[PDB]
Amino acid sequence: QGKGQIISNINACVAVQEALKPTLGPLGSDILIVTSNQKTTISNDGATILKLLDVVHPAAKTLVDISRAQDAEVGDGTTSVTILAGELMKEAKPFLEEGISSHLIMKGYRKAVSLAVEKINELAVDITSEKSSGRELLERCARTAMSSKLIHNNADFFVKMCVDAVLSLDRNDLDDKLIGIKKIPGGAMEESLFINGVAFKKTFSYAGFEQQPKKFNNPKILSLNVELELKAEKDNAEVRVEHVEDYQAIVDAEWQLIFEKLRQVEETGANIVLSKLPIGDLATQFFADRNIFCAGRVSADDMNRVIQAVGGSIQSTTSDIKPEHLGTCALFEEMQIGSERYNLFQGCPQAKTCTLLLRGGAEQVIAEVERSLHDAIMIVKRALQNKLIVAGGGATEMEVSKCLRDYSKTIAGKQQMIINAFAKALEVIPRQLCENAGFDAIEILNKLRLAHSKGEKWYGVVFETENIGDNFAKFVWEPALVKINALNSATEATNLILSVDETITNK
Amino acid sequence: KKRQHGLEAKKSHILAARSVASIIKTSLGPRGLDKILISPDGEITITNDGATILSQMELDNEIAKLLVQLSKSQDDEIGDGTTGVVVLASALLDQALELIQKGIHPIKIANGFDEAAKLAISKLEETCDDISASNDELFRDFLLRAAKTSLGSKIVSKDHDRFAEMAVEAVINVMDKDRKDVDFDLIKMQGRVGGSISDSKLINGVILDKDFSHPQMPKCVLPKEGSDGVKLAILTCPFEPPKPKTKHKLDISSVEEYQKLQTYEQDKFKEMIDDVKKAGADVVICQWGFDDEANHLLLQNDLPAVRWVGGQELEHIAISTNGRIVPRFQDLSKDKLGTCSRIYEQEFGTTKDRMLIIEQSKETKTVTCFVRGSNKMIVDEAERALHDSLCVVRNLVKDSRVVYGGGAAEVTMSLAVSEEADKQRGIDQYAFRGFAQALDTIPMTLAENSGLDPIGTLSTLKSKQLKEKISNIGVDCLGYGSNDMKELFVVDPFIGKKQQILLATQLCRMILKIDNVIISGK
Amino acid sequence: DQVTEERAENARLSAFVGAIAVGDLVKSTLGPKGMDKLLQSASSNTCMVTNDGATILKSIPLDNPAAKVLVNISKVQDDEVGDGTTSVTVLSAELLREAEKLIDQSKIHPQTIIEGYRLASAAALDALTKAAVDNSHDKTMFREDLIHIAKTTLSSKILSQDKDHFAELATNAILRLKGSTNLEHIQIIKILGGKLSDSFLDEGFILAKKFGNNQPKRIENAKILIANTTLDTDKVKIFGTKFKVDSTAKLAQLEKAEREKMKNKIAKISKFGINTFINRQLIYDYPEQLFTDLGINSIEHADFEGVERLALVTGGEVVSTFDEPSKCKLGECDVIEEIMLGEQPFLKFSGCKAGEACTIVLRGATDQTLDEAERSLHDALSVLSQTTKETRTVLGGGCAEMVMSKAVDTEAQNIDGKKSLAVEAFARALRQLPTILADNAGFDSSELVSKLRSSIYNGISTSGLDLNNGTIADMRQLGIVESYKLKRAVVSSASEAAEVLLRVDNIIRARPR
Amino acid sequence: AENARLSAFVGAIAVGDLVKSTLGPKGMDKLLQSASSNTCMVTNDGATILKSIPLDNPAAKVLVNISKVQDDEVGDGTTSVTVLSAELLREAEKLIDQSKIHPQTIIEGYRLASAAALDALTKAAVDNSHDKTMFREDLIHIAKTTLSSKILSQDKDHFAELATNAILRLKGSTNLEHIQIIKILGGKLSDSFLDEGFILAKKFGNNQPKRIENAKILIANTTLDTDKVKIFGTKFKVDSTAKLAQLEKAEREKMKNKIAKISKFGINTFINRQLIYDYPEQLFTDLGINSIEHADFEGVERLALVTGGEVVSTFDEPSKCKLGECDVIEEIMLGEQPFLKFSGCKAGEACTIVLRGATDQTLDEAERSLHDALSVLSQTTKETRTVLGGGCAEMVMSKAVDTEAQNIDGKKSLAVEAFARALRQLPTILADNAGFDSSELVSKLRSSIYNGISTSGLDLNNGTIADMRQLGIVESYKLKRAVVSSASEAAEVLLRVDNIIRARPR
């Protein structure tokens, strides 16, 4: 209660803030976090770090709630939102000792963000024209994120395969569900394949395994939810019987019910028959003689992706199948990686989605790879509606940082110090970079003051050559529009935490 | 929960597995020693395998999961010479501790390993030999030369000639005439405890723990009058007197209706035995039990049968006999009958349980090595040793390049990385040399268990490889004297050393990036 | 957590003492002059007194893994010799003790010690092969040498003083089997009471069951039938059936149909023309009286193990599905009568149709000898059956281990080097096996063994140790000889198991659950 | 035999295995950390090791008493005394249990072996006596054998000339109190100085001159502390303080009369046993006489042997008793604290050796080296026979033990040969610390002596067989006889134990 309760809520965010310090930047290190799912998460970006982080103090859930908002919004580099919001609370400790209310602090940071929305539009420039565009601009923006996390050395081969997968995305549609992919364990870390359609692992074994043909030239896709096995009827199988010969007829009727449905599966002739439920060994030896691809225990999400790809449908009756319920594709090639067969759907009637097949035994690698694809669709969405970018490396916030010091210097007295603390809080982004890079933050930040004033605008910080240079001319860029919602979301969350003077816990 | 920052969790975290991996260091090479590991259930497993010990061993630090996660991918990738490879997997993290004290950034330490890893592989491609350039006869001779060094690793290496023909003849049955193919899935080794270890033979098929029921007939019938593979058959549906499995009720309004229920099964008893006798199938495997009244008529019609056979073994029988297991009694036909050359039950001990053995003398899809031994503990150890041989031949198939073994590879690439480190200069000159320095600990560790001077042997290797570029000079593990590996027929797969070192280098890049350790309960 | 790990310092000493501590109990069980041990079980308060460590070491809890593999390999010895197999653990304990003193003196690497045992085992196989004698060429001496082979293998139990009375049992029984290696054919029955020498070998089968009510105790020229069909429990069904009736009139008709079910079932049994019927399960009262009306014997409660031994000894066949009367075979015996052996009277069979199997009647003083004679007869004819397959034999009784010592000492000269220390250590440890045997009878293991050592080097193969008089006597005169197949598996498995125990540099103890 | 003797065999061997690393010149020193007082001591000799270690086995405590015998008689290389007896207990675990022989018969086998061992030591002894020219020159190499068993061997050649000149100044003195060993912190072992005189760690007075030539030194047992102690149960009865102030002041002049009696001697140096009051101390300055005090007991005794004087209590007669004279008594400051250096003694009655070292543990431990080495030099003068060590003496005795085994034969030969095998394990343990091959070195030494070469021996420096006469390895017969005869009889008592009686603790 009182000023001590606010500090207690800030100290709860410091434990999260200190853990996310290595999580920002290409040269930032990684943190090890163990969860209740027995999944060890070693990652760079703090996107999935805040979701799997164990929350102790109740006030720490404020940074988690705002993280999911920026998760679907940006998703890449969102760990700096809580770091900047943490600095606003950390630098508020000398403000709590004074008589400045949190609402006076609310108006201080809001005027800096309200102008920052206008500065980002001014600091950026419309590119378009004959300059960097698709197959070029998309490669420059995706290389910054991906190469800043993992596969540092081999990113030339690794990122190039992922950028070529995003190239299949076209305008006028821009569906957000196209980022769905799968996880393939095993294989070499430097080897990756490209697939334009849904891939699903066997996950079961049966006697007709080695007899299953892996190559179909012109298959026909059919989706059915009917489970093939000997089992009791839906509601009640009780049958009143008088004659003795009718009991064997029931055994025949139970067979005739299944055996007639087994013939209806082969009567359609579709070279691809998928079952939503498991498939038993009763229909194996029968259906195997027909030599048609079949997969059981298929997840409901993978079945819905096929419906959204070839336009198929799931029906429980074979006689009700319509002519358009049978889909066709260009080629079907079943790939086997590590004694695990994978189906491949190539040339769907409409497919804008590309499912990347990865390799390696480490499960935590795909966490950022799926996140890189989540950022890749954000780059495409933000490159169309509004065309502009800014420099990469994280020096964009330092350009507007001094612009806030110049304007607010003459503006209404005490409000200078509050805004100056915000501009001072914006320096944490290059501060954590210089700490993890072994550089000198004193000499660099002093040169940035001249680099962001007499050095015009676009000059950034180059980590490779250990010097200060232009990232805009280097062609390495960072999405500009992702910082608009990132800076404004941290202010409303910081103003909410500083406005809580007491915490109630029942029981 | 404990608070660890700075060098606390950036050093002791690596030092933890450093002391754990030094335990199995004494098991490196054929000169290694075994270990005892007690399972939490109370059972005791004695083996020297690095992957088997670390799999069942329960440790404290979370770095143990990083060592097990690598071994999971190594089994599906290479998994060859596990006792030899498991030691060098942790040798990359030992050298990184010295670069931290010198002031090099941890990420610069990790990024410097991948730079020198691609150059070390290119140097190894100079001295590699192509075994596929010869014919099939010389290829099998190269397998015999490789099976001496490669196959034999662990105990039972006393007599290696008994298992030499086991691994060679196993890949001959299933293989392509152009020497591009592999199947390790249909090859399963089921051993038993008995006799001597030198009694192992080659019998293609499966070994069933269940014998022929109703001990009222002969244990085995070697020939068959119908010939054509004895007509093996397997019923998928359980064998029982036919009755509806779903809930039903019977209504008996007269004594005649009760008498018809008596002849009900009686008519089905003759119907089930005649459908099998009409097809003439001698071997009929029932998955779940059988009927007690039918336990006789099978012998009356001369129809040997078994009960309670696992579904995993049933898949290997149908693919070996080129038949199809019968899904339904009405679907029974002579077209689904299999082919079995010879079937018999092994005497094993005095009584115990007679083991049914299905054998195909001709070419078959299921290859199996008959294995018997006196010691019970060596069973699981000797099987998994020969199970890796399936991937050994696979490495020689998919990769035609073969390099001379005996630790001569790491010494060959040591001189190349030392010269390539001087081209970059900067701070990476000591970082690239450190990556080759960690590989130089492998030859010094090989001579540690044998009692040979680690540096005195290593100094001769670089001195001999300086005059001649041939890599046949390598560390002598077994004390053969002169270090030439060409006369000793010591060769290792190229892709074996390639991936196992590369995947270990790719994993240690993310390991050295660990700063804080946060552990939460399940 | 709570994982106690021992490095090469602690694990090397702890693994060697583990097999020596528990191995001291099986050292005094060697040979016919060996002693026995007692074990106190916390459950049921039972005990087992025997010289065979297969039932001793298995029930002794031990935290030392060194002897865990020694118990598993005892099943291999239980499948080959079965009597006096404790020498495998004793010799292995000596190899661990000599190697413990070899590493403390020579200080060579343990892997070099194993390489010495590898070359020493090759010289042991050459001495046993060159000394192998095959008497199977003469059928007259072959049947007489089976007695000499028996006298060696049949002395285990405290009752070995009765071997002279028990030698005729295994001599004629192995001739009746004519190649039957299975114990399911051999009929072994236990009887409490009577003198220790009252055990005899009868031709026939002995059944511990009786006749229910009216069945005459003496039946001559009877056809024995074995059936797995259900009698006692009758109507038990197990259908999907339920019972619904309008009045009690048809309720009794179901019981009348039960009589018609058994009346039609006994009609098919009456078509067999049998005077004797045997069921796996119990017999209900109604078919029990039908058996007496038609003059058919009744035998019930034959378990899964006993239902086979009936047809295996008598040469019959278990018959089911009575609808085929003439498609099966019927057992026949000359005299079927009830006798009295001990307190419980037994059913005796005589004049079996097939002499493929025999019945051994065992009568003894105490219940401790029941399981004791079972262990001695666990492998008795099977040991003689393995001599029928492998006919090469060699003189045993402690001399064969001394003959192999001459071959190892000869091979040690051709090897020399620093590996001969482990080769000589195997020869020194092998000569200590008969030394412990002489320690069991309380005789001199110093002067006698020293004379037996020089006698082998002088070129006398037949020289051996006399157990009764405690002197030097020829094994051909005493009749002590063992087959080549049994002794080869004892020496080889003892050396192979010792190679694994010397390789333990670490002992990991996980926290119990 | 089993429960009677159990820990008496393995327990005694486990104690010898701890000191196994301490045996031999190439061995290492063990750290003794006491559970009380938080002190520590580093010593090779088993006299201190076995004394401070807790021993649960009563047979192990017996090994301490036999160690104290070799500690006073020899003191160097006493580790092999208890180790040799431990090997006899290992062979007794077999012959008594396995071979089933009564323990007294095994003891009788060692009794006849002990008589045969004494015959091999006397016949193989080399006589070095008569002329002291080549004898004293050989004492340089003879001492180096047992001189340094430590890691300090770098001081061998340096202390070889000092230890040789030490007995030269004694001129046949067999008393170990006539030599003075000084332990000084700091410096190196090669900085040790040897002069004729004595160096005291005390100092002179305030005004006492730093250099005095031809000074006459006289000691005494009196007490100058203050006044006069007189007899017990005294008191002062006076009318007032006028007489009391005179009684206390007059006795200061009465002590001056005793100092006036000192001036009649004409001595330039005075030494008192107890402390001296300032007034009689200043009276020594007026007469120009040095003063030395604070000597508990041996302070005045060690200086009496060097100066050759006599304690004079009465100071009555300047005629009889003794007057010592030293050429130069000048105070010489060495290290930190100032020292009193005496030179030009009246005779060679005593001598002083000064030692300097950086580690305090080296001063206390190396003191036992020169203390035992001078005892060896006194035994080589008395006992004229010497033998050859370095592993050769054990194989020579093994030739005589194996020879006696052929005459006795019977079943006692197993106990006689076991005694020879126990003598074969000592050089194996001796060469175990160097880390060389046992089977290679022992077989070359054992077979060479059977061929008639008694001059060979084990060389642990080069790892081969070399001549012990060329390397300078020589042991006196008094040292060899005392170790073998005691170690043979040490295990004789340990083998007589048929029962263990454990008393109730207090």
From Swiss-Prot, chain A:
Location in the cell: Cytoplasm
Lineage top rank: taxon: Eukaryota
Entry GO MF terms: ATP binding; ATP hydrolysis activity; ATP-dependent protein folding chaperone; unfolded protein binding
Record-level GO BP terms: chaperone mediated protein folding independent of cofactor; protein folding
Xref: PROSITE patterns: TCP1_2, TCP1_3
A cellular component annotation (GO) from this entry: cytoplasm
CDD domains cross-referenced by the UniProt entry: TCP1_eta
Alphabetically ordered keywords of this record: ATP-binding, Chaperone, Cytoplasm, Nucleotide-binding
Main location: cytoplasm
Function description: Molecular chaperone; assists the folding of proteins upon ATP hydrolysis. Known to play a role, in vitro, in the folding of actin and tubulin. In yeast may play a role in mitotic spindle formation.
Family designation: Belongs to the TCP-1 chaperonin family.
Complex and partners: Heterooligomeric complex of about 850 to 900 kDa that forms two stacked rings, 12 to 16 nm in diameter.
UniProt name for this protein: T-complex protein 1 subunit eta
Organism lineage string: Eukaryota, Fungi, Dikarya, Ascomycota, Saccharomycotina
Encoding gene, per UniProt annotation: CCT7
Curated annotation (Swiss-Prot), chain B:
InterPro entries: Chap_CCT_epsi (IPR012718), Chaperone_TCP-1 (IPR017998), Chaperonin_TCP-1_CS (IPR002194), Cpn60/GroEL/TCP-1 (IPR002423), GroEL-like_apical_dom_sf (IPR027409), GROEL-like_equatorial_sf (IPR027413), TCP-1-like_intermed_sf (IPR027410), TCP-1_chaperonin (IPR053374)
Domain of life of the native organism: Eukaryota
A single cellular component GO annotation: chaperonin-containing T-complex
Pfam families hit by this protein: Cpn60_TCP1
Annotated GO MF terms: ATP binding; ATP hydrolysis activity; ATP-dependent protein folding chaperone; unfolded protein binding
Coiled-coil residues: none
Cell compartment(s), UniProt: Cytoplasm
Keywords, in A-Z order: ATP-binding, Chaperone, Cytoplasm, Nucleotide-binding
GO BP: chaperone mediated protein folding independent of cofactor; protein folding
Family under the similarity heading: Belongs to the TCP-1 chaperonin family.
Function: Molecular chaperone; assists the folding of proteins upon ATP hydrolysis. Known to play a role, in vitro, in the folding of actin and tubulin. In yeast may play a role in mitotic spindle formation.
Subunit note: Heterooligomeric complex of about 850 to 900 kDa that forms two stacked rings, 12 to 16 nm in diameter.
Protein name: T-complex protein 1 subunit epsilon
Swiss-Prot record, chain D:
NCBIfam families in the record: chap_CCT_beta
Database matches in CDD domains: TCP1_beta
Top-level taxon of origin: Eukaryota
Descriptive protein name: T-complex protein 1 subunit beta
Main localization, broad class: cytoplasm
Pfam family, one: Cpn60_TCP1
UniProt family annotation: Belongs to the TCP-1 chaperonin family.
Cellular component terms per the entry's GO annotation: chaperonin-containing T-complex; cytoplasm
Recorded name of the encoding gene: CCT2
